[PDB]
Amino acid sequence: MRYIHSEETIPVPENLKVSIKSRLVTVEGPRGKLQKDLSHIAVNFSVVKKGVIGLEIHHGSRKDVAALRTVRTIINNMIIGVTKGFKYKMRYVYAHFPINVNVEKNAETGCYEVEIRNFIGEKIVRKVVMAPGVEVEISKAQKDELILSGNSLEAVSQSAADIQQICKVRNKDIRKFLDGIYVSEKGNIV
Amino acid sequence: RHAQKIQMRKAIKQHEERNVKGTAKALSSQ
Amino acid sequence: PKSKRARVYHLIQVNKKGREAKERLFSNIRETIPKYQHCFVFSVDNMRNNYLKDVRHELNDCRIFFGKTKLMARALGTTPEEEQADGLHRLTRYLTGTVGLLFTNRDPADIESYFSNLSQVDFARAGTVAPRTVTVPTGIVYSTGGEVPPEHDVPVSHTLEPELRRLGMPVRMIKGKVCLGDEKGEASEGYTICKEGEVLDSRQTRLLKLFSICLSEFKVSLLGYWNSASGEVTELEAGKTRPKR
RNA sequence: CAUCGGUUCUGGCGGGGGGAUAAAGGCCCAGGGAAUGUGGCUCCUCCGGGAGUGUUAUAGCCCUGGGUGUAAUACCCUCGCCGGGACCGAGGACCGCGCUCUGCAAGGAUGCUGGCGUAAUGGUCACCAGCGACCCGUCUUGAAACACGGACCAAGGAGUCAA
RNA sequence: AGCGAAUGAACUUUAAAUAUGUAAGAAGCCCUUGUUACUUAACUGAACGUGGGCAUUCGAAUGUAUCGACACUAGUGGGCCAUUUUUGGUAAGCAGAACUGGCGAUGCGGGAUGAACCGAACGCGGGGUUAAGGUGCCGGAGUGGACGCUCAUCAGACACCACAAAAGGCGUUAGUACAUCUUGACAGCAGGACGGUGGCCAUGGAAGUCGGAAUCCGCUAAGGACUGUGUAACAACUCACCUGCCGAAUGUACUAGCCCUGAAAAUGGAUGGCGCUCAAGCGU
RNA sequence: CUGUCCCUAUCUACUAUCUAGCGAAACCACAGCCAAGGGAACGGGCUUGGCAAAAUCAGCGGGGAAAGAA
RNA sequence: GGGAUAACUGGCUUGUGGCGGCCAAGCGUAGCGACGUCGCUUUUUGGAUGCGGCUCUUCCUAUCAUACCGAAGCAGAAUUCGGUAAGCGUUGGAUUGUUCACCCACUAAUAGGGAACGUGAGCUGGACCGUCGUGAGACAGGUUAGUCCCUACUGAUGAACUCGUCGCAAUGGUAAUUCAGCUUAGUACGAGAGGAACCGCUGAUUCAGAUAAUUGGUUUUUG
RNA sequence: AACGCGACGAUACUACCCGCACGUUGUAGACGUAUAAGAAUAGGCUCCGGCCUCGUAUCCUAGCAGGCGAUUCCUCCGCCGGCCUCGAAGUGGCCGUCGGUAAUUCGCGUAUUGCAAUUUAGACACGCGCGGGAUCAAAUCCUUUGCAGACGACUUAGAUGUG
Incomplete structure (x- = not known):
């Protein structure tokens, strides 16, 4: 129908600064620095009040307004990440064979590697290299559980999904073999 | 899908009616 | 257009009331207004x-209404021209x-004495500030969460395992029994709710509701009452601050 | 190259007529309205602005009749006047129709000029280039298709005579 | 059309569309009386003749490039396709008539190609304008103008016959009908979701949810002798419904465009090829 | 043992690159690269695409051959 | 005996029967009407068939195995159904005139098709007349039809660019396949009987390209 | 790729390189054949003033097809040397020398090509002449080899030697 105008608003907190280029968005705060490109979506960014960013679209369709809402949520997700961060708590359960999860950080490539051993007694060691900027901890808070914290929600969730997918059973009974490493809680660090 | 939609529409009408509300085999067998 | 949710037609023996119940409420308030002398607002x-x-x-000998506030407001009449009483x-x-x-033929002194003596311990409900800290003991969890002595307690039903996990307790099934860590304790620390x-x-x-521990207090608070004979309101102490309309 | 005739393409200019003697529109004359409500004012934790109320006020607008006005312009139909280009020059004393009639654009091109006067123009072959283009005959059928004859060349080669 | 005209396709004042036979002047009609072997009761009728009437619009229009008679002479006796009308048949094919048109013996422009399609028919040349069909070069001419629609994991570029329907599409646009909403609509979040009653029969056990039948009352804001999860039974959760917060348009069924699928085999190939996406696709 | 098959042996017959010299015939419209389209189960020349480089030697297992229909 | 037709299907074919009733949005204002359901086929106790067969090239997928997935009381194992997938492979018997069905043996399995009216290439296993008849045929009675070259592919030379050496890589082809054994482990799992998998290791089958140390065969070494 | 390309060795003549005298030599076609940011297009450029639809812009453009001379000008071209730079199919900068040079102004010559006739003028390639420097090569046949083979083709070896 070619709606003439559509707008969305995103508030920012006092303790961050958001520098937005042509369509590059960089957000800085106590957690650190986070950058994302959104050049694939047509949108006009501007400031409406002291601490709200208004993103608008003109002469667009419902698909365009839907993209407007999606990019609104993405910007808000980056603001939330740079303020509070993200945290995914997993737990690994087993029946007779205990799973040995060893986490290490190498100076090279500045990333983390999680090595899983003795998953259903398998003699293969399963190594997952993580996305940059995610921290992995075997906490002494609960037994046989892991914490995956970070600043980028997409990286945190994709790393959690990668570990979950790599530790999966083959050619067995799902109802009978319950073992694996599974996401338990999702939230913010602070 | 056609069968399922006919079945669900008939079920909807039948349930509406019953919510509002509050021999050939014999011959062949003989 | 297309690309819309599919709303399920429920196989339900009860339908939406709407204006039938609306008019039943309207006529009920009309027939209740003249019968009894005092109309309390709680x-x-x-x-x-x-x-x-x-x-x-x-x-039993008094009639209490608790329905839609705007419907009851117009039914009693929000303007001087639609009022049953002045x-x-x-x-x-x-x-x-x-x-x-709350329509009565009884005496104020008695009714607020009743409502000041009435109080019942009930479940928390959202928004309340916790009066204490609850932490289920480390080990086999029971149907009480370490309030009743365990020696007189019963193990929790095993069908709440997915629900407790969804609410976020790192609980496991060991030999049919729900536990935090190990059956013999030790293992890990406790879980604070x-x-x-x-x-x-x-x-x-x-x-809190699933563990059946109550942390709030139910007490009805009277904002003000109305006496039809003298034709007078009486701000009750509470109504003083309550955001009036 | 200049002045003509015939056919033709194309650009511009000056008028006339018709609509509802265009409808609009400017400026005035009255009358009447409203709101996407101007100015006031009344509000609102106002970078800012909103909301409220009401009929010109410190913007305006709509609608109805009236004058300028036989206004202008658009569109359609018409009377002419200039400019640029292409192709063509059939006939060969006069006769005729005419005219703007010493003459003429009037029953068909003359006038002035330059270079060359020789392979320069023109022509023939071979090649290239762009475009076009089934292998002939016989036979059948409504028609194709099949089928048959065709290695090439020279000479001979088939509706004649008589009653 | 009407039956406020009568009567009741078989009714009518009137009258459609659609093709079609005949006639339209001196090659005339009458009227009038002479004859006849015909005829009549009869100079009475019919035929054969006389007189008159209009030679100018002489008896509609339009063309007319002449028409008629006789004698003689040569080649011809096939059909195929299609429109319309019409009779019959099948699951579908199809079969048979009538008229007309194209091909025969016909070149040329276009449909990329071509028996049947569209335009138009022909001496040799020059100039101009067109038809059908086209204007992204190949290819002459528009990356012309206006308003919209469509993104296809082998779209479409005219096939609309089939596949193919009361078909499947949480693809997209326009429209119609119905319904609810500041008496707060849809979605959501926080709560209620209660008592008789573990209602009757049956089961070892079955308390709303293994089974059979009815399904009531109160409390009401509302709650089903219960829509699902669950237990050996419970318990517990959840749905329906209701209240608070939020705040303004929603949601049910059809219809009409475009798009996808709606069935496909086997050497590598076809909107003519490239290629084309606010088109170089579709409608005006 | 066999009215069965195969192999080994023998015989019969046909089986043969280049040089010197000698030296035909069959057959021959003109040709000869493919794929789609060319209504008449028809293509070899036409449309539009793939492409496409002189002159030769050898091998050859493909095409240049077929119906006529109750 | 006469006439008409003289081939034929060609965006055909495939997976879900027909008949009658009920319902049936609609069209319509009686008639057509899909999907479902009910009745018949059809139930109260467990041989058919009357042109075949074999080798090789290429293609299809409507996938038999292999690879990866989704679902199943799928404990393990062995499986069943479905999906993407044609890269890779895809037997021998008994019986019968032949084939299929059933049954029996190895195997990972021992799938189905096209090469376009001539099922890619190769091989193998009558109708007319006449006589006499006709409740019926017969005739040693006659006549008669049966049509070494170009090109593709595989290799090998090659003039022009002075000869030669050393290279690049457009384009074209393309390759690996399956099974088994050890460890995992008599572990996971299982009442028991049974009983895997990833990592690691080693062989074998088919296919492909090479090779003559050795072994076997061949002998004009006529030694 | 036998009509795709590169590197290097040796290249007797012919002429290998160098300069001009050129050529009645060729060309799918000189006539100012002038012009390097990158990146984005719901942003970009900048000297940091501002600027951006617009390449209908910048450069260049006067002189017998462009003469001779003179006041004034240090501006713009060209050629050779040194230092450096450019490799994706190989160039540009600086300096220097030397040559030419309207930014202002002036005198002398243009005539006759007769009223137009392409204003024969550029580039690269190739060919004929000179005069300066430089060098004195290979392949095939023939014989031979067997790592090869139908014939060709291929690996080899013939000049004094580990022949």
Whole structure:
């Protein structure tokens, strides 16, 4: 129908600064620095009040307004990440064979590697290299559980999904073999 | 899908009616 | 257009009331207004208001209304021109939020003595500040969460395992028994639901209700009453601050 | 190259007539309205602005009749006047129709000029280039298709005579 | 059309569309009386003749490039396709008549190609304008103008016959009908979701949810002798419904465009090829 | 043992690159690269695409051959 | 005996029967009407068939195995159904005139098709007349039809660019396949009987490209 | 790729390189054949003033097809040397020398090509002449080899030697 105008608003907190280029968005705060490109979506960014960013679209369709809402949520997700961060708590359960999860950080490539051993007694060691900027901890808070914290929600969730997918059973009974490493809680660090 | 939609529409009408509300085999067998 | 949700047609024996129940409420208020001398306005702020049946069974000889506040406000009449009695439109500002009416031929002194002696311990409900900190003991969890002595306690039903996990307790099934870590204790530390002096959320409220520990107090608070004979309102102490309409 | 005739393409200019003697529109004359409500004012934790109320006021607008006005312009139909280009020059004393009639654009091109006067123009072959283009005959059928004859060349080669 | 005209396709004042036979002047009609072997009761009728009437619009229009008679002479006796009308048949094919048109013996422009399609028919040349069909070069001419629609994991570029329907599409646009909403609509979040009653029969056990039948009352804001999860039974959760917060348009069924699928085999190939996406696709 | 098959042995017959010299015939419209389209189960020349480089030697297992229909 | 037709299907074919009733949005204002349901086929106790067969090239997928997935009381194992997938492979018997069905043996399995009216290439296993008849045929009675070259592919030379050496890589082809054994482990799992998998290791089958140390065969070494 | 390309060795003549005298030599076609940011297009450029639809812009453009001379000008071209730079199919900068040079102004010559006739003028390639420097090569046949083979073709070896 070619709606003439559509707008969305995103508030920012006092303790961050958001520098937005042509369509590059960089957000800085106590957690650190986070950058994302959104050049694939047509949108006009501007400031409406002291601490709200208004993103608008003109002469667009419902698909365009839907993209407007999606990019609104993405910007808000980056603001939330740079303020509070993200945290995914997993737990690994087993029946007779205990799973040995060893986490290490190498100076090279500045990333983390999680090595899983003795998953259903398998003699293969399963190594997952993580996305940059995610921290992995075997906490002494609960037994046989892991914490995956970070600043980028997409990286945190994709790393959690990668570990979950790599530790999966083959050619067995799902109802009978319950073992694996599974996401338990999702939230913010602070 | 056609069968399922006919079945669900008939079920909807039948349930509406019953919510509002509050021999050939014999011959062949003989 | 296309690309829309599919709403399920429920196989339900009860349909939406709408204007039938609306007019039944309207006529009920009209027939209730002249019968009884005093119309009290009470409030329930953040309670589960399930004890209204008990208070009704107590006040069999009085008629309490607790429905839609705007419907009741117009039914009593918010303006001087639609009022049954002169000043019920004064009462229709005390009728503001989660409030209700209570029609009596009884005496004030008795009725607020009753409502000051009435109080029942009930479940938390969202928004309340925790009066204490609850932490289930480390080990085999029971149906009480370490309030009743375990020696007189019963193990929790095993069918709540997915629900407790969804609410966020790192619990496991060991030999048919729900436990935190190991059956013999040790293993890990405990799980705290809510801490004292901290606003409690819906997840914590659900956990409290499932463990059947009550942390709030149900008490109906009277904002003000109306006497039809003298034709006068009486701001009750509470109504003073309550955001009037 | 200049002045003509015939056919033709194309650009511009000056008028006339018709609509509802266009409808609009400017400027005035009255009358009447409203709101996407101007100015006031009344509000609102106002970078800012909103909301309210009401009929010109410190913007305006709509609608109805009236004058300028036989206004202008658009569109359609018409009377002419200039400019640029292409192709063509059939006939060969006069006769005729005419005219703007010493003459003429009037029953068909003359006038002035330059270079060359020789392979320069023109022509023939071979090649290239762009475009076009089934292998002939016989026979059948409504028609194709099949089928048959065709290695090439020279000479001979088939509706004649008589009653 | 009407039956406020009568009567009741078989009714009518009137009258459609659609093709079609005949006639339209001196090659005339009458009227009038002479004859006849015909005829009549009869100079009475019919035929054969006389007189008159209009030679100018002489008896509609339009063309007319002449028409008629006789004698003689040569080649011809096939059909195929299609429109319309019409009779019959099948699951579908199809079969048979009538008229007309194209091909025969016909070149040329276009449909990329061509028996049947569209335009138009022909001496040799020059100039101009067109038809059908086209204007992104190949290819002459528009990356012309206006308003919209469509993104296809082998779209479409005219096939609309089939596949193919009361078909499947949480693809997209326009429209119609119905319904609810500041008496707060849809979605959501926080709560209620209660008592008789573990209602009757049956089961070892079955308390709303293994089974059979009815399904009531109160409390009401509302709650089903219960829509699902669950237990050996419970318990517990959840749905329906209801209240608070939020705040303004929603949601049910059809219809009409475009798009996808709506069935496909086997050497590598076809909107003519390239290629084309606010088109170089579709409608005006 | 066999009215069965195969192999080994023998015989019969046909089986043969280049140089010197000698030296035909069959057959021959003109040709000869493919794929789609060319209504008449028809293509070899036409449309539009793939492409496409002189002159030769050898091998050859493909095409240049077929119906006529109750 | 006469006439008409003289081939034929060609965006055909495939997976879900027909008949009658009920319902049936609609069209319509009686008639057509899909999907479902009910009745018949059809139930109260467990041989058919009357042109075949074999080798090789290429293609299809409507996938038999292999690879990866989704679902199943799928404990393990062995499986069943479905999906993407044609890269890779895809037997021998008994019986019968032949084939299929059933049954029996190895195997990972021992799938189905096209090469376009001539099922890619190769091989193998009558109708007319006449006589006499006709409740019926017969005739040693006659006549008669049966049509070494170009090109593709595989290799090998090659003038022009002065000869030669050393290279690049457009384009074209393309390759690996399956099974078994050790360890995992008599572990996971299982009442028991049974009983895997990833990592690691080693062989074998088919296919492909090479090779003559050795072994076997061949002999004009006529030694 | 036998009509795709590169590197290097040796290249007797012919002429290998160098300069001009050129050529009645060729060309799918000189006539100012002038012009390097990158990146984005719901942003970009900048000297940091501002600027951006617009390449209908910048450069260049006067002189017998462009003469001779003179006041004034240090501006713009060209050629050779040194230092450096450019490799994706190989160039540009600086300095220097030397040559030419309207930014202002002036005198002398243009005539006759007769009223137009392509204003024969550029580039690269190739060919004929000179005069300066430089060098004195290979392949095939023939014989031979067997790492090869139908014949060709291929690996080899013939000049004094580990022949």
